[PDB]
């Protein structure tokens, strides 16, 4: 042989505030380099591998050779200045115990299960929209509806009293407050852990359809421990708010490209498919989330991922796979196979996938059908987006409509 340098150089991938829904140029680069790359994020230590292809992302995330529990044994390079989920949360559990914990609340998150809160949710959404209209045109869609709605729906499903909604949002906010290197988020986590630990105990260990009752009944029959239950209850509540940000990009885009909004207004039946196309395209987060550790050597596209090596997958990059999604950057409401991985893949796939689809469904409906001539009150570029955050999205969405 000769002089083989088949190992990709560690690419520095600093935290950078992107505008609107533009694609990360660095991620663009990582994708062109090769199937397997190496990156260095703002925090933690080391380099961790990076997979971007649709097929390799499905492999890594659904293969027993890559685990999550081991990820805590080291300070894997990352984007967030501290691990959000505790040492017992779903995100860090592997198939054996992970499957058990997720089964306890499965019934509430399937299409049929979520379909049970459709009417209830529709009514809540309608009150918020009615309130927006009554107030008057110059409105911030995020504060007026995209923020309150998802919060009300998850709390309702979880069994959280409507009077405690403000607290969930405050805690979620602080917990995801992203950076420094300490306990504003830690205290916030203990407070919310304490909140759900008590709710799970407060007779919610008897009978009821809400998730906390399911978790309480499960804890009562030794199916899952209280730690696992609180850990899951906490991440569901938090993930619940992920819709605000995603739907924010959805609307910023629909009103940004009038031809997309018009197709949805004049052709309602295609809304489901369009929403899935929008979910595939929308760059939901910054960089990547929680890595996996190779539990044993594994060869991928010529690269040897040594046991002990951290591996990252980019669902955003995967949803932009040319071979799987021809003309990737184009938002086509038709799109044939469209097997996007915006909700993850493998055992850790998002349990809120169907709920979010339902929420997105009602939002598009209510917003496009009840607000005549809804449009941005400012130029697309003048809309501010979240800075230094994990999940990308509008900070506010100024819009106006016919009325005034
Ligand atoms: C359209 C909005 C949403 C998007 C794009 C999204 C996306 C994701 C992604 C990419 C993951 C990680 C998969 C992995 O680790 O491989 C995840 C995990 C998770 N999501 Fe979501 N999510 C959304 C909404 C929600 C909602 C509303 C909830 C609350 C019911 C939720 C709860 C969770 C939980 C609990 C996990 C951790 C699952 C586990 O590790 O077992 N998500 N989500
Ligand atoms: O919205 C998410 C995006 C991720 O990449 C992600 O890893 C995640 C994990 C847990 C809840 C939500 C999310
Ligand atoms: O990006 C994320 C990474 C996590 O580990 C995580 O737990 C999370 C939860 C909710 C929204 C985003 C995230």
Curated annotation (Swiss-Prot):
Summary of the function given for this chain in its UniProt record: Catalyzes oxidative C-C coupling reaction to polymerize flaviolin and form highly conjugated pigments which protect the soil bacterium from deleterious effects of UV irradiation (three isomers of biflaviolin and one triflaviolin).
Positions contributing to flaviolin 2 binding: 285
Family statement drawn from the similarity comment of this UniProt entry: Belongs to the cytochrome P450 family.
UniProt xrefs under Pfam families: p450
Gene Ontology biological-process entries: pigment metabolic process
Enzyme class: oxidoreductase
Keyword Oxidoreductase: yes
PANTHER family named in the record: CYTOCHROME P450 YJIB-RELATED, P450, PUTATIVE (EUROFUNG)-RELATED
Species this chain originates from: Streptomyces coelicolor (strain ATCC BAA-471 / A3(2) / M145)
Entry EC number(s): 1.14.19.69
CDD domains in the cross-refs: Cyp158A-like (cd11031)
Residues binding flaviolin 1: 285, 290
Catalytic activity annotation: 2 flaviolin + 2 reduced [2Fe-2S]-[ferredoxin] + O2 + H(+) = 3,3'-biflaviolin + 2 oxidized [2Fe-2S]-[ferredoxin] + 2 H2O; 2 flaviolin + 2 reduced [2Fe-2S]-[ferredoxin] + O2 + H(+) = 3,8'-biflaviolin + 2 oxidized [2Fe-2S]-[ferredoxin] + 2 H2O
Miscellaneous field: The structural studies suggest catalysis likely occurs through proton relay via a 'proton wire' formed by water molecules in the active site.
Annotated binding of heme, by residue: 350
Cofactor(s) required, per the database record: heme
Protein's name according to its UniProt entry: Biflaviolin synthase CYP158A2
One MF annotation (Gene Ontology) recorded for this entry: monooxygenase activity
Record keywords: Heme, Iron, Metal-binding, Monooxygenase, Oxidoreductase
Site (described: Involved in determining product regiospecificity): 84
Source taxon at top rank: Bacteria
Stored SUPFAM superfamilies: Cytochrome P450 (SSF48264)
Pathway: Pigment biosynthesis
Matching Gene3D superfamilies: Cytochrome P450 (1.10.630.10)
